[PDB]
Amino acid sequence: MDIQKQEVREAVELPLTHFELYKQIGIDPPRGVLMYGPPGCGKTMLAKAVAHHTTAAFIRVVGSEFVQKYLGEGPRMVRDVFRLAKENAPAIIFIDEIDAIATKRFDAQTGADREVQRILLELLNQMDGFDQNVNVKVIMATNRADTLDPALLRPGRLDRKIEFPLPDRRQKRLIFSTITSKMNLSEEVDLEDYVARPDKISGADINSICQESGMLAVRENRYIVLAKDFEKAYKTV
Template sequence: ENYGICTSTTGTNYYVRVLSTLNREELKPNASVALHRHSHAVVDILPPETDSAIQMMKMTEKPDVTYQDVGGLDVQKQEIKEAVELPLTNPELYQQIGIDPPRGVLLYGPPGTGKTMMAKAVAHHTDAAFIRVVGSEFVQKYLGEGPRMVRDVFRMAKENAPSIIFIDEIDSIATKRFDAQTGADREVQRILIELLTQMDGFDQSVHVKIIMATNRHDTLDPALLRPGRLDRKIEFPVPDRRQKRLVFQAC
């Protein structure tokens, strides 16, 4: 009575211990349960309507940030227009010249240099749904929830296309892979693998664009930066004196 077999959202079967405090009448075949990250014990019985997408994701209304609100960064504005805005608003331009637009864009640079504002600005100038997620929110306390949330993000983006997925602090789940020593490390690696799978799983006709932001692009897993995933990298450097003046003028 104190043990059972369950299948995680990653597809792995576990022979697990069931806490004695749980209501056995609610523990039925095909019930959704929560596993402890380290011991894999069943610690909770989840209601059928549990939806990680509702708990985590923020599909906001059109952001009110415009390009004019972003001081300076003229080169970065032009690059993100070409990589994200034009493919969503005028996809025929790319079809006419016979090239595929970038599937994903990486914004990188020190904190406070305008990466998040730029992502909001490009969403403002399109009719795309804007789905914002912080990378660390994928790392949950229950085994398998992170990969499931990744799938939910991309499912929501496809259902609401055209859309923009903005994942901030991507370095929290996409650093270079190593021999995982703990259950938490293995879970983060499963999240990254699921993210790569989802990025490879849709074509350009879906009209979903991916923007990721990081302060430490040098720590990212090379697999994330391969062609067909994050095709365009846009640097946001520390502003010089002229750029600082433009920032204050925009305030």
């Protein structure tokens, strides 16, 4: 890494205070950060790291929070989160899995998805009008970008495309130590074959895999997790 945490650091959390900086420095840093990586679910460890480092609100919303038979409450929700973002604290909006609301469709029998993507174009014009004197920081990541529309990835909207196929061995040691340091550890719990093999096989959301190993240690029969739940959690999930 060393460029992901630095670019997201100075482009996300440094402008998160004294709003006058956005126009004191001139060109406001782009707020659009598009993560990738379809092996695992992912998109959670960094949202938690920001949720613990930065002390602010976080109004997370699943990508299908407004996909209903109605059309309202869209600009009401995003407008209320905008006005509280520029009113109380610039909460970071987490819009994950935009492929459900970004799928191509020409037929008019499914005019609900086309209608809510026309609302997505309405708020697209809103964020077009939200480039001057506004407190907004919306992170938008997904697992597949081959089906994403060109209007979303247009320059000026999403100017950061960070790729994360696999973390390096040092980031493996850190991503395993940050979760095994709190949980029950032992001498059989080793990071050598688990730094070698998970570096060969492509796998994201390693923290979620260790949490699944916690679901394999939730029996309370064995007080300390061992290599059986680790390798079994590797071959299963």
